[PDB]
Amino acid sequence: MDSQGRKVVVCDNGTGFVKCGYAGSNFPEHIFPALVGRPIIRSTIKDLMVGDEASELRSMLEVNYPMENGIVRNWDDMKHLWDYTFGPEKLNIDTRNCKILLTEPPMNPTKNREKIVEVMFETYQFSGVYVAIQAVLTLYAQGLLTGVVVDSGDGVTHICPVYEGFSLPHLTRRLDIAGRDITRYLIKLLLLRGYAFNHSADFETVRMIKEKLCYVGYNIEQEQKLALETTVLVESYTLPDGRIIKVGGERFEAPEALFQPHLINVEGVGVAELLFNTIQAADIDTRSEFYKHIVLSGGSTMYPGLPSRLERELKQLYLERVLKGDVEKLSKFKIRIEDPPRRKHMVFLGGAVLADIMKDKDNFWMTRQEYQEKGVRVLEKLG
Amino acid sequence: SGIVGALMEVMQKRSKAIHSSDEDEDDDEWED
Amino acid sequence: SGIVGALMEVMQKRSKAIHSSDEEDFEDDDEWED
Amino acid sequence: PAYHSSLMDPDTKLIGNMALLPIRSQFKGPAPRETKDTDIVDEAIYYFKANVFFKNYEIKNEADRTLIYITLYISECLKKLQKCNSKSQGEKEMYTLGITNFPIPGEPGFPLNAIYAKPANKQEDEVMRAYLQQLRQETGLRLCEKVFDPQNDKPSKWWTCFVKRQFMNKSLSGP
Amino acid sequence: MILLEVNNRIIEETLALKFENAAAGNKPEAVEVTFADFDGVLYHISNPNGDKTKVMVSISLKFYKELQAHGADELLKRVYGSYLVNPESGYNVSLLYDLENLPASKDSIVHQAGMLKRNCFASVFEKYFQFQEEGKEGENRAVIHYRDDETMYVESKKDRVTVVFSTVFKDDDDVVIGKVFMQEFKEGRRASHTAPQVLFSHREPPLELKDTDAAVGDNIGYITFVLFPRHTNASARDNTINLIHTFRDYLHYHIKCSKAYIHTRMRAKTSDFLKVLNRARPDAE
Amino acid sequence: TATLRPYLSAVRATLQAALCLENFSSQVVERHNKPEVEVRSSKELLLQPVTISRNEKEKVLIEGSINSVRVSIAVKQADEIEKILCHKFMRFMMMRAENFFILRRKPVEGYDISFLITNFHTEQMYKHKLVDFVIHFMEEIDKEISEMKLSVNARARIVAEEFLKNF
Amino acid sequence: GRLPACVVDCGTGYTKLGYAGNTEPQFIIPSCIAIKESAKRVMKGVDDLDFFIGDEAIEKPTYATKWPIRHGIVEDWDLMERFMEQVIFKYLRAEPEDHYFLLTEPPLNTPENREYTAEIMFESFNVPGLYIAVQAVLALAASWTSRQVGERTLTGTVIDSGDGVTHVIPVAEGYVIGSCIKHIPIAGRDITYFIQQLLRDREVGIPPEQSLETAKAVKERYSYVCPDLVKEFNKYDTDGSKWIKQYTGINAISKKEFSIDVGYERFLGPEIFFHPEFANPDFTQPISEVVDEVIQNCPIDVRRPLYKNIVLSGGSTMFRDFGRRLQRDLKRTVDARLKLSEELSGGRLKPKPIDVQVITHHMQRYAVWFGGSMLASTPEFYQVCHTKKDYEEIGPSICRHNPVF
Amino acid sequence: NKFVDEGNMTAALQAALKNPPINTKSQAVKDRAGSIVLKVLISFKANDIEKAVQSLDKNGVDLLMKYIYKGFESPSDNSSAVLLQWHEKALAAGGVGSIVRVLTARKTV
Amino acid sequence: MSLHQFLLEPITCHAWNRDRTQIALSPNNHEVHIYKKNGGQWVKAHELKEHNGHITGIDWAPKSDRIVTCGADRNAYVWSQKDGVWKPTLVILRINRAATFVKWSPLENKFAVGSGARLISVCYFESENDWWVSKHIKKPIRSTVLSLDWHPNNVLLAAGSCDFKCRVFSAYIKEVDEKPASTPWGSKMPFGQLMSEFGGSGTGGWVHGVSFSASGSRLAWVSHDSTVSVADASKSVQVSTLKTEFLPLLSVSFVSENSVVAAGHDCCPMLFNYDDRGCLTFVSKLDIPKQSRNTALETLHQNSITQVSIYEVDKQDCRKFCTTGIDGAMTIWDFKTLESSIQGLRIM
Ligand SMILES: Nc1ncnc2c1ncn2[C@@H]1O[C@H](COP(=O)(O)OP(=O)(O)OP(=O)(O)O)[C@@H](O)[C@H]1O
Ligand SMILES: Nc1ncnc2c1ncn2[C@@H]1O[C@H](COP(=O)(O)OP(=O)(O)OP(=O)(O)O)[C@@H](O)[C@H]1O
Ligand SMILES: [Mg+2]
Ligand SMILES: [Mg+2]
């Protein structure tokens, strides 16, 4: 809400979930899945079903993800999802008088951003659109201007160093493991126990099982010793139809694919070695500032025991590959992993802070008129 | 305004509130 | 290789033996096609 | 699936939601005289032994309601013709059964009331009762000539084995 | 089924089905089966040279030379007669049955064809029983290797016939259970008076069995049967043979049945413990 | 019950004091919940182990913590047949350990059976019924083993009798 | 020199017993056990050895007949152990310490049943090796006798049917896709109650204790599959001399003879496979729609090999024109879907016409046993078996997963 | 930072429960004190155990329960029946809290 | 005396409002259920769901009408009612282990959270950007803090933990509090200053519950040593211990200046007396059964009691008190009926 009476809306479009709200708030107003479903029953209620209810009866439909790692695949499904977002079921706003802040993943093509700005200005006709980088918003939410952001969501896990409020583009790294790969590996591990689940019709049940029971083991020699002698790791879960399943030693085996990618046939190294190589690839005088401020983000870093394991692996790598002979020199060096419990929505809080600061400055936003007698060149004000 | 401005002391206040662990990073007023 | 190649070897051995062992009221055919 | 009628004509008199198909009969009634050798009674007698096992029928046009009505009345005639012993007593007992005041659609007693539609005025009701009586008498007279073995003059066992089967678990009379 | 059977089954149903189809009048069919029995004995029923009007049954024993040294060929020639032919290569004894020249009552020949293994283990017992009946003393004992590591010893004294077994228990529980079973066999002369005398010795050979290659280790037990002339006369002796050559399989079969009955009792007690432990939940039963 | 009753009374009275548990999260790995008698990462949350012995062979070891109790029981094995019967019985229970919820898949060394009771079981079952179940378990094992020995002896007698009869 | 392995296949109605290397099973016996009557506990003496299995179990006085296998899964394990005792030590006459074993399992089986079977085999009989095999790969391997060298793969759909439920199992590259397995409640028993109800309604003179055996004999000796129903009824009504048969039987008590007329139940028997609402008023879907749904629930790249290699198996698929009727119904359903997609696309979708082929071979009655026997006759069978040493050292967790490849 | 801590047999029992080790770290003193206390205990009679039990305060009952639970660890002859009878008579006048103070003790004796 | 079986699951904690017409409780999961009494039956009115972990503490302020919750997911929220729905507000705690206990201050301007990372967090309000900030007390705590209680002068704070000791700290914050007066506990009161530290030599159990008295000059705590102890600060910080003959007690409360009521694993509340000379004495159980295989224990609670709270007025005048248990029941006891039923039971 600015001085002229126009509402400011912060929208974060993920591969899996759309999180939308207003500027200045500390909580997201709505979180819902991002999928568009069509009835396969007519191929064998409503012809176009979109939203979380389309995630309810997933087995009755066939589904499509319109967004894939910040790249729009199906434009009509993305227009239907944005029509559902700015509608009376979720937000109930009049888009003729609003301003909107949208996010953007690192290493994005320019043509996708131009098309997104053209759809927001021509179809919905907003009064002001701004596009921001997600890592800068993640550091803005915590209170820092210099750090290394490790964000694992639903698409591609990214490691990005940001220095003095600007993201360095020639040092960012990516790893192709996220929550869908962990869910597929959990389906593959649960097939050996005897529970058979479909890869498309039963994705949400295994997603809720993964959100409920899975964790990351600290010592990976102690967990299966506890799993070979005791029955304390076996937990009972109730399916929606009525059956009761038992999940045992697979709780600590699936997120171990984050640290060992060759379990899911992906070449490369783990997240800790990639983080060490990303920090060590920078110049010498700014290494310790990157080591003192490492911020985790994303919904896939919500496993219990993950930052303790990450700090242990990073300290072991820095001991073995840099100092190489002394445990006394390791104590003076400072390595900090920042793990707040609100880390699932850092991008929304950073967008809310940045929209609440700059809600009155006319030079920040780009208006409808500056699109109207310049076209695509209004994106020249972005950077 | 722009890049450096009111944003700087907003980030200072947020770093004071959220990161308060730095003012204990290390390991007559009550006369009565 | 493995058990599967030996399985095709033993089926290829048995197939001509079973085919050599087997060496009118329902002869109508025209009702079956569409 | 089940077998449907094929005598649908684009200019047919639609009595209610049924079809006023022509028949070949010497009985008096409002049905038109049929010139061809195939009518709906012979088609229903042809399809009765295959249709009676089915339980899920689907209505496609207006001849199917006449088809299922004649199928239910063939089931009632087999129930009354199980106990007979000669052909002429079968003719007399079909002549008794044809003039029985069976319940029409609209009245309580007709089982498939939701599929069917009741008439509106009195003359449509009168011609519907006359048409159903003529259809009942004609299919009784045609069913007499097929159920009887001429060398033995007793009812055959190949036709009296469908007594305890019902079409769509429905009956035209009481239990 | 407490006692084991001496007739093989598969020979009897196969020959009975072929004989009934031949006697009915139908054309015969081709047959080719290979199967096994106790103590590593192989059987093969086939058609010679592809001729479907003739069937042929061949047996394979690993130790036929030792039985041939005591005269097993004359007994098989005396029992079977004209059905005995030249053996198949890889097999020891072969019988040939023609489906055209068959006798009327086809009941005795199927029963004689079913006891081919029993008729192979009957020469040495009849020879030593004849040595006991004639009164000759001082003949050498018979060493039969009926398995890979098990040995049968047959000796004829002046007034008794001694049969010594040598069994090997593989599992460690089987030694204890067989010790209990042979302790019950040893005192079994209290109830039944007219019976052969059973003796048992664990881990050591008997004193009469000496200057041999007898086993020493902890899984070997020795079982001694003492048979009298009331058991080794003429018109009992075949019945005695029908109880002697199936003793070891009877013993191991009853040990395995006891091990199954213990599993049944453990299933019942575990179900009772789970039914007791389920009741402790608050209002969730 | 020449010495069985005071032995079982002492075992019951020791088990009443040990089963006083509560929920406790781990203080070395964040958001973890593990039984403290198996992990043994913190010394101040562990109680002293105790044992109760009836003779030189039969004994019960009880180890406690803030949220977990481990109880190891050694069973009397007189004869050689009772040793293999007890070993088959204890091996039979530990394979079906997922249906018992309080049984370990591998015993502590020197003992025959081992129970592990956490604080989640005391929230889902009554405590005194669990104590009565442990006492009932220790009472019923010896009766089952004695009935097994008598049944095996009777079956061996009848199996010997039939074969010596049929001669 | 080397003894052959033992192959045992257990079912709800019949169990098949024999040795490896043969083309036919040596014994096919009913899967029932006749225990002694309870007449009222501790069984003093050898009272658990007083039982009969197989054909001796049926109709024995002062004995109770029990069926331990219900829809493919074992209910009572004590009866299964006492069953396998008289399988091994009476019929096969094999010493269990010298022979490797191969057993079969239902296609939807828990690992706990595998652990119980491995417990019984390794601790009650002391076998040196054990292999628990899936039935679909064995049936698909037994289907290679009719086909030549080039069309010999391990991708296809297996339709298993008899005395139970009918399973539609897709398998790709030797691995069963367990997420798409569907079942139909019509099987070989329901045809026997349908034929028994028809013979009870029509004919007279059958003794009331021998209706089931006469219905089973009429099903096994005279039934077939018709292309159309009303034309078959017209054929039976017009020329009644050619098609109506006569069946004779012998009474058990009075030792007399009876003769009945076999009529409309020759084609109305198997027709509940394609019209299940005739007998079961809960299931209305025909078998071709279930097969099409199972194939359409598979991934995209595997759907065209699965249509080409449909393999029939089981004892209830031994009617005359089964594959031709199933092939015609599947081609009609697929062509209906393709014409619907072509009219909905409006000239955008022009797919290739696929090839549907249903395979009938000689050893369709005992396909699973034949595949198990020719698997166990290989020299490489002994290197994928679970030995007793690994069971003693590691434990009973080795039998949860199997080495197919 | 690991957690680091800082005819007159009745008069014979009263003297044996008197002057124990309290803070010493020599194991031989603890072993000889446990030896003389258990030597007093197992040579006692059977009828007058409760007369010795009900002539003690709360700390004497706690120390007696600690020595009884120490005496079970090294079983010899028929001493365990005497120790079980002593445990029953000490439980009859000491409660379950004596066993709780046995279990929650940072200094063994 | 008045049971009400709310659940079949355990109740971790409970809280009452000011007029005792509504109750908030956690049914052993990540939700908070608010029940309302209409007439004579309990009807579930509201459900609060924001945590993704096991909830360990609920407290309800009497005047400002706000509910603070903390759980095992290292998170805490404060809930306020608007337009008939309860909305949450963030608390920045800065802890890396789970939180175990939460208590409001008497003046409702701070709240204290005891957690498992060997520290106590004292939180106050910041309205410039609408959250709650915290300050930390670390030394010399060495293990997990299990219980807290506030002195009635809004400064001092008692804490018991798993290192077998009970300590008194000063929780003075210059931004929200006023300058306090001297107490018998001490005079120099900066933030985090250790006032006193009571424990035991050699022996000692985990301190499960602490409480101040009405005047604030006496303290009581219960251990896992089956001991209850009362410290007096006016008589030169002396301490008196009593060794019970029962199972350990998990809660304690001053109902007057000379009487304490405790409960625990015995399924039964007990009363202890403390005279002016410093002699702690056990008086009686408060659950004497009526004089007259299904087990059917002779207590009103079938499982362990984890919380004792005062139901009527306050510590100045106590007439009723309430207990909740692991069996899933809420019981209200009355001192006037217990005096007539049980002979020899006088409350002093
Ligand atoms: N508590 C949890 N523990 C583990 N995984 C979780 C948890 N909660 C959510 N997830 C998983 O995290 C993913 C959601 O992450 P998030 O919402 O940050 O993704 P996103 O913003 O759509 O992704 P991206 O920005 O890469 O496009 C899903 O795979 C979900 O299953
Ligand atoms: N022509 C036929 N020949 C033999 N059996 C037939 C024939 N037609 C139908 N059947 C039926 O086949 C059934 C036996 O089938 P099958 O042996 O495959 O059953 P199963 O033992 O349950 O099989 P599975 O091993 O697949 O579990 C019998 O009920 C029999 O009525
Ligand atoms: Mg994201
Ligand atoms: Mg079957």
UniProtKB/Swiss-Prot annotation, chain A:
Top-level taxon of origin: Eukaryota
Nucleus keyword on record = yes
Q: Which GO terms describe its cellular component?
A: Arp2/3 protein complex; cell cortex; cell projection; cytoplasm; cytosol; nucleus; site of double-strand break
Q: Which residues form the signal peptide?
A: none
Per its record, what are the GO molecular function terms?
Answer: actin binding; ATP binding
Q: Which GO terms describe its biological process?
A: Arp2/3 complex-mediated actin nucleation; positive regulation of double-strand break repair via homologous recombination; positive regulation of lamellipodium assembly; positive regulation of transcription by RNA polymerase II
Name where it's found: Cytoplasm, Cytoskeleton; Cell projection; Nucleus
Enumerate the residues binding ATP: 153-155, 207-211, 298-303
The UniProt keyword set, sorted, is: Acetylation, Actin-binding, ATP-binding, Cell projection, Cytoplasm, Cytoskeleton, Nucleotide-binding, Nucleus
Q: Which residues carry this modification: N-acetylmethionine?
A: 1
Pfam families, alphabetically? Actin
The protein's predominant localisation is cytoplasm
Q: Which InterPro entries match?
A: Actin (IPR004000), Actin/actin-like_CS (IPR020902), ATPase_NBD (IPR043129)
Quaternary structure and partners? Component of the Arp2/3 complex composed of ACTR2/ARP2, ACTR3/ARP3, ARPC1B/p41-ARC, ARPC2/p34-ARC, ARPC3/p21-ARC, ARPC4/p20-ARC and ARPC5/p16-ARC. Interacts with AVIL.
Sequence similarity: Belongs to the actin family. ARP2 subfamily.
Q: What is this protein called?
A: Actin-related protein 2
Native species of this protein? Bos taurus (Bovine)
Swiss-Prot record, chain C:
Biological role stated in the UniProt entry: Regulates actin polymerization by stimulating the actin-nucleating activity of the Arp2/3 complex. Involved in various processes, such as mitosis and cytokinesis, via its role in the regulation of actin polymerization. Together with CDC42, involved in the extension and maintenance of the formation of thin, actin-rich surface projections called filopodia. In addition to its role in the cytoplasm, also plays a role in the nucleus by regulating gene transcription, probably by promoting nuclear actin polymerization.
Residues where Phosphoserine occurs? Answer: 20-21
Q: Where is this region: Disordered?
A: 12-34
Q: Which residues of the full protein are shown?
A: 465 to 505 of 505
Question: Which residues fall in a compositionally biased region of kind Acidic residues?
Answer: 22-34
**What's the source species for this entry?**
Homo sapiens
Report the superkingdom from the record: Eukaryota
Subcellular compartments: Cytoplasm, Cytoskeleton; Nucleus; Cytoplasm
- The residue stretches assigned to a coiled coil in this entry are none
Q: Whom does it interact with, and what assembly results?
A: Binds actin and the Arp2/3 complex. Interacts with CDC42. Interacts with FCHSD1. Interacts with FCHSD2. Binds to SH3 domains of GRB2. Interacts with the C-terminal SH3 domain of DNMBP. Interacts with SNX9. Interacts with the WW domains of PRPF40A/FBP11. Interacts with PTK2/FAK1. Interacts with PACSIN1, PACSIN2 and PACSIN3. Interacts with NOSTRIN. Binds to TNK2. Interacts with SNX33. Interacts with NONO (via second RRM domain); the interaction is direct. Component of a multiprotein complex with NONO and SFPQ; associates with the complex via direct interaction with NONO.
Name this protein carries in UniProt: Actin nucleation-promoting factor WASL
UniProtKB/Swiss-Prot annotation, chain F:
Query: What domain of life?
Result: Eukaryota
Kindly state which keywords UniProt assigns to this record, in alphabetical order.
Acetylation, Actin-binding, Cell projection, Cytoplasm, Cytoskeleton, Nucleus
Pfam family of the protein (one) = ARPC4
GO MF annotation terms: actin filament binding
Function text: Actin-binding component of the Arp2/3 complex, a multiprotein complex that mediates actin polymerization upon stimulation by nucleation-promoting factor (NPF). The Arp2/3 complex mediates the formation of branched actin networks in the cytoplasm, providing the force for cell motility. In addition to its role in the cytoplasmic cytoskeleton, the Arp2/3 complex also promotes actin polymerization in the nucleus, thereby regulating gene transcription and repair of damaged DNA.
Q: Which family does it belong to?
A: Belongs to the ARPC4 family.
Quaternary structure annotation from Swiss-Prot or TrEMBL? Component of the Arp2/3 complex composed of ACTR2/ARP2, ACTR3/ARP3, ARPC1B/p41-ARC, ARPC2/p34-ARC, ARPC3/p21-ARC, ARPC4/p20-ARC and ARPC5/p16-ARC.
Name assigned to this protein: Actin-related protein 2/3 complex subunit 4
Swiss-Prot record, chain G:
Cross-referenced SMART domains: ACTIN (SM00268)
Write out the GO biological process terms.
Answer: Arp2/3 complex-mediated actin nucleation; cilium assembly; positive regulation of lamellipodium assembly; positive regulation of transcription by RNA polymerase II
Named from the GO MF annotations, one term is:
ATP binding
| GO CC annotation, single | cell projection
Q: Name one Pfam family in it.
A: Actin
Among SUPFAM superfamilies, the record links this protein to: Actin-like ATPase domain
Q: Which residues carry this modification: N6-acetyllysine?
A: 231, 235, 242, 245
Domain of life per record: Eukaryota
Q: Which CDD domains match?
A: ASKHA_NBD_Arp3-like
Localization in the cell: Cytoplasm, Cytoskeleton; Cell projection; Nucleus
- Keywords of the record: Acetylation, Actin-binding, ATP-binding, Cell projection, Cilium biogenesis/degradation, Cytoplasm, Cytoskeleton, Nucleotide-binding, Nucleus
Query: Gene3D superfamilies recorded for this chain?
Result: 3.30.420.40, Actin, Chain A, domain 2, Actin, Chain A, domain 4
* Chain's role: ATP-binding component of the Arp2/3 complex, a multiprotein complex that mediates actin polymerization upon stimulation by nucleation-promoting factor (NPF). The Arp2/3 complex mediates the formation of branched actin networks in the cytoplasm, providing the force for cell motility. Seems to contact the pointed end of the daughter actin filament. In podocytes, required for the formation of lamellipodia downstream of AVIL and PLCE1 regulation.
UniProt lists the family membership as follows: Belongs to the actin family. ARP3 subfamily.
- Describe, as the record does, how this protein assembles with itself and its partners: Component of the Arp2/3 complex composed of ACTR2/ARP2, ACTR3/ARP3, ARPC1B/p41-ARC, ARPC2/p34-ARC, ARPC3/p21-ARC, ARPC4/p20-ARC and ARPC5/p16-ARC. Interacts with WHDC1. Interacts weakly with MEFV. Interacts with AVIL.
| Protein species of origin | Bos taurus
